[model samples]
Target: MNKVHVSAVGTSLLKNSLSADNVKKEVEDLGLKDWDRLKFDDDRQNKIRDNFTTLKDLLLNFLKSKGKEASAELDSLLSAIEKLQHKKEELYVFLYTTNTWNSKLAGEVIKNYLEEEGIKSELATVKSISSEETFHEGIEDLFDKVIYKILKFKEEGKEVYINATAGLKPETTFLTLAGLLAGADLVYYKYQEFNDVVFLPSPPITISPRYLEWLIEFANYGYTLSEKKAEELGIPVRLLEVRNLVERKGEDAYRLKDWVRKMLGIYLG
Candidate 1:
């Protein structure tokens, strides 16, 4: 097992400390421990249901405040989701079809492909698995690959970071990927308008069968905020492990307007 650790500026979430620029450690907690969902329990499911209800209400309120009828937009979003869901299922199907010789390698390829497409990925991969261990042991390689990719991004003068779907459940992989893609699309289209350099962070949540759906729904909340919120809330809207996702966008408002207040670690000179 190759242990791996990656870090960047004070902004690195891998560090236990918050960035000096950070004000609060805001997190969205569905409150499940690591690997708990793979065991399967009813309590986890209930937590997901409750959290999703609150999340939906929050979004509904945001939309209603804008006097926007979300029914149509929501429907469009859901349909897009269905398509992505099919694509994800197809990925698994293809994996199973191709000899079924190595699930680990197949899954790793899928993750690498998705990461590359979602971000402007600069990839590094270990060609030889070499170690005879469980699929879990290969996590070290995954971490290394991401770090190598991050280094490549740095060489190109890009503010870089990585997100992974390693801890996510098989069933929710599509929704998670869809939420990320939706977040990315919203980010690029609406974010470009402000003429600011926005650093899109990786998906920073642990995927749980229990809370995957809720997290997907919450990601839509972030996507909507990035796309439509004209007035800056002075806060990072998404609740996740990383702080920079929404902060980078808010930094745009700060840069344009000048004298912008810092909220949720987002500020600009």
Candidate 2:
């Protein structure tokens, strides 16, 4: 497991890189909440659409003009690779980035830094995961891509390491689950607070049958509905209380975690 032939690093550093250049507050000044995904036809949507293209232009323009510097993505990536390299592992890296425009900006910065350090890597982007409007569709697509790709790697007799750091928390969580479900050799995270990598949990690829029964039914719709509505759909009040499995989506409403919802498809299908 020490000799990883391939590593997939999830990449989403939009906020960090923006903050790195001190432009995060500028985007925030648009009156958009950080957690609120931009919707179609909203003013923030227009700004997001236009600003991403402009920022990408700046990234290509500045990335070449000045050479790129390390940000949150690269910093965490370096930590992971350093550990693997420390053990004499010759690894190739895949930068698993989102469809979002700024996602590429962050991935490009990391890709540039990797080449400088003589590490071999590729920018591996997946579709559907790009649009905030169609994000759930994209989430299901992302799950398929990551799981299938890693399974291919495993079948090739290649050792895998997943860097579950640097992306949006939800995206990273999905990648982590895919890694574990597909039997990755390592799935590690490097919090900004610590310089070292922390190895994450790796449960054997199996779902509890009782839990699966409750989860499969709930994920049918109720992306966000009232507690009464969930019970009206026949989801048990006790099942909703399935701690750590389901979480409160909004006041008096409960829903599956993105990873939990996506995995139920693979687990049941």
Candidate 3:
């Protein structure tokens, strides 16, 4: 079976979560140089330096010399796959991150880690999500792409999952929401305080027949059945299947349930 798990990559896989300043100390120690640009240097050029790049390099260097620790992404993936591994053939993963220093670095580390486990995976970097200037725009852009990507996977007949662990606060918040909007099979995230990942499967998004009925009719006759068939269908169908989008009454026709229609202002068939 074809399967894909879209995961958010962050610095957790490499950094110490307990200590806020641990990464900075580690980087400075490993590089044996000063990296206090943000604190001491008011120079634009100093701030312009790729601080995260140095951090990534030093972290990688450190990992090479030593070993790695359990990260949110790792812990979560291991839990999901190990429990489900014996039941499946292969697990495909898509690591979503930005091209910024730490985000990109995180993606690479996760990809390599997955490889070590003999899992198939790929990394996708969205430029917008990386910069502070474009952060807001990035999540919306990510949202649009992720929603479509999830649906496309379903269309291709693959079971899809979303892992919201280890991503930025804003991104992960929407990841769980978008996972449901796109009809992903399973959605989960790993919490540091919790011993294991929490399961937050996609629940149905419900709309009253009154609302859906008019919405469907408006779409149906807006420009004939074609337009009706096209507008928001992938969403309608996917969302509906989870909740039964529409219950068919006859060939080439859809109507609200009798009681539902009576309940609404629209009376008579």
Candidate 4:
């Protein structure tokens, strides 16, 4: 069995949910040591900064108003987030359970995907997939991190791919999804700058072991479609799967659903 190994400059850790002041303090800790040359030091940089503070206050006030209130709506919102998170975990379990996932195969798939997508992807080694057999419990937490990285790669505008073999579960799906989503987000945001309605192209990313464990899950539910094919068909879900963009219609739509539901519940009380 081939293996796929994941690495970054250093091991990663999570930070607690942060408020605006927390974010500001972190930036302040960076000291803007070279701010003398940055517009950040200019007086004109103050307006947007001021506006950000005001927005923070307004948001905090709204949340405070929810204190002592029923949390049913918030519970539903968190549940939806968990469901999406579960899908990501399912994807990882499917990708890693193969018999083979060597570094060479991973590199090749990545190269092929990039060529097809008109982008370039580079890595020192494809290595081995994590030896873990499955991610069952809070698997969503870790799997989401992996998915986030893949999305980030594409956001940088590069090619991506994965192996087409069954025994060898290459890491290409992770690589490709990351790139595809990121690219979609970039395109979405750029058009949004001009108030333009953006469209998504069939993203050029694919994976093998079509009959794998997680693929089976997607198959059972029928949400698994080729990214490119879905784009061609103009699936609403595909259209909504943008990464790192200013605003994603699909994501925003989800947020709106939660917001309105909460408002309705509060008013009826």
Q: Poorest 10 consecutive residues of model 4 by lDDT?
A: 8-17
Estimate, for each residue in 112-231, the C-alpha lDDT of model 1 and write its tens digit. Answer: 333433311122233333224433323333332333333343345433211221222321233223224222221111111232223234564333433333323333333334434433
Winner of 1 and 4 under lDDT: 4
lDDT of each: 0.26, 0.59, 0.58, 0.28
Candidate with better TM-score, 1 vs 3: 3
Better of 2 and 4 by lDDT: 2
RMSD of each: 23.6, 8.7, 11.1, 23.6
Tens-digit per-residue lDDT, 35-90, candidate 2:
12432224554455556555544444333443323344555556776676644336
Cα deviation at 191, candidate 3, in Å, is 1.2
- Candidate 2's error at 235, in angstroms? 19
Candidate 2, backbone clash total = 0
lDDT, candidate 3, at 80: 71
Using TM-score, rank the candidates from best to worst: 3, 2, 1, 4
Cα displacement (Å) at residue 69, model 2:
8.7
- Cα-based lDDT at residue 162, candidate 1: 18
In candidate 3, where is summed lDDT lowest over 10 consecutive residues? 32-41
Off by over 4 Å in 3: 17-26, 29-69, 86-89, 130-133, 206-269
TM-score of decoy 4: 0.18
Q: 10-39 in candidate 3: lDDT tens per residue?
A: 756445422335555655454523222122
